[PDB]
Symmetry: C3
């Protein structure tokens, strides 16, 4: 079941890629993009109490507007992970559906201090397809939050070193 | 609180998601959209403790365990997010682990690619990918057998001071 | 965060990456007035329990000692044969050179059977951007039935200057 393979599949051409898109967490719609999975400490009217988990199938679009070209999906879960200032842990992938990156994914395991940090860095822990052996990071930042409902648009920039 | 020989291995084995009958290797952790047809509805979470055999038969040589959770992750179709380790119990890689964070997409891709996100023991500094095809699937009842191919880079050995510990005493390699 | 990030455009290898050893104590507080965790789902920690944690990291084994970070995330009971944990967590540091920075961990944690448990660093942030390495956790102080614990951590990461 183990089988040592030779390293000599070696020399590969390196690429750099910058992605820029908009992440849509649609809470209150008639077609919302997430669902609460668990809420110990109950339901707050605008915050997320420590311990609650949300599954998420959030669209990634070229611009702030929902009509703009779909370009990927952010799927996974986020969890309220601070008993002090509200913070989240993102455990998700970003799956690309467009052009040269269709089918490829990037993996994220990151803390997300949405209450206090204006530009938030997230670590790329892995990639697939075009992003095999991906090495990079992301910077996230609120484009808008609607605190009536709780919908949010997050602007992402991705910096990823990888191969062709 | 602060201070300041790479190998490459192919692995082949079989992943046993066992839902039906006695001996279920998993359990459902939450389902906010109840039960569904032949699907886990969006938001369902399932804890696994799945055997890893050298061949597709349950009776086959057990060689590791796939431990973690998966979540049904699409509203448009059935897809999974795997958050898991593969912990091996045999051979050179006994006691070693690989970690996976990956989208599955079990209804749309024959071969599903998954990034190796890190490793332990013999797999320290692991980087690589997995490919997963079904050997056998039953979206009616749920269980399935999944073939895996893993190609992983990694390094061997150890580093090179000890603090007293009332439990474990001294030493640490040191 | 910071207004610029520099790095080497390699994919693999260390190029301009350095090596750091961290040592601290992880506080799993289950009982008493103010616990550091919450049970999230429960389909002593039976298979499938999910716990969310917000655990203080201190430079010594005392709660008293200087706070240097938080370990935050979820753990899950992942084993049917004995109590075993999957950790999905970040370590966020708040002191000294690595104030602001984080490390990500995705790891099995065989708390009943392994006196030293190795956990993969799968990512970092800020001063730990592109982090690679491992943590070693061993108990300093454990009560298996109440659940409280102090875990000694040694962390070895390669990361850039």
């Amino acid at each position: 079941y183990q089988s040592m393979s030779p390293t000599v599949l070696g020399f590969q051409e390196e690429k750099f890629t910058h992605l820029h898109f908009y992440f849509h967490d649609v809470v209150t719609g008639p077609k919302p993009s997430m669902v609460i999975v668990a809420e110990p400490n109950g339901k707050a009217k605008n915050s997320l109490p420590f311990g609650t988990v949300v599954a998420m199938d959030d669209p990634l679009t070229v611009g702030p507007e929902s009509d703009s070209k779909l370009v990927g999906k952010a799927q996974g879960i986020y969890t309220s992970i601070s008993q002090e200032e509200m913070g989240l842990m993102m455990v998700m992938t970003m799956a690309f559906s467009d052009g040269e990156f269709n089918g490829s994914t990037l993996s994220i395991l990151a803390r997300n201090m949405i209450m206090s940090e204006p530009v938030r860095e997230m670590a790329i822990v892995g990639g697939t397809g075009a992003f095999r052996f991906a090495r990079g990071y992301a910077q996230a930042k609120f484009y808008s939050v609607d605190f009536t409902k709780g919908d949010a648009i997050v602007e992402y920039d991705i910096f990823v070193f990888h191969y062709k």
